[PDB]
DNA sequence: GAGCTTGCTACGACCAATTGAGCGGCCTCGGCACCGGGATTCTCCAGGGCGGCCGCGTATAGGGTCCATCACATAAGG
C-alpha cells in the first residue's frame, strides 16, 4: 500500500519508481491530490478503482 | 543649381455591376505537455601526496663588521 501524500518534493520522491511492474499493488489517494495531480494517475493503469 | 512660370495630359477619383476570395462557423487526430528513467556531469569537502613555507632544533653557509697590512718616496749617514 502506497500513501501518496505530501509536499511535492516529496511527493515526487514518493513517485520515484510508480512504473516499475508490480511497484505496489494499491496506491490510496485524496481527491484534493487527484485535481493537483491527474497527469500521474491518468498515465497509469489502474485495473479496478 | 535652385525657384517658378509656363501649358496641358494621362492617370487616377468616382461610378454601376459581377463574382470569388476571404471570413465565420465548426469539427478533429497528432503536436504538444509531463516526467521516469538511465545516464551525464558538475559540485565540494576530504585529503594522498609534493613541497612552499613554518616549527624544533641539527649543523651548516654566509655577510657587515671591525681589524690591519701595505705602498710611496722619504729620514738619515757620509
Not at 510508480?18 to 496506491?27: Q, T
Request: aromatic share 16%; proline share 4%; charged share 25%.
Amino acid at each position: 500500500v502506497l500513501t501518496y501524500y505530501g509536499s511535492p518534493q516529496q511527493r515526487k520522491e514518493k513517485r520515484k519508481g510508480w512504473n516499475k511492474p508490480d511497484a505496489f499493488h494499491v496506491c490510496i489517494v485524496s481527491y484534493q491530490l487527484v485535481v493537483q495531480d491527474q497527469h500521474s494517475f491518468k498515465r497509469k493503469r489502474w485495473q479496478y478503482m
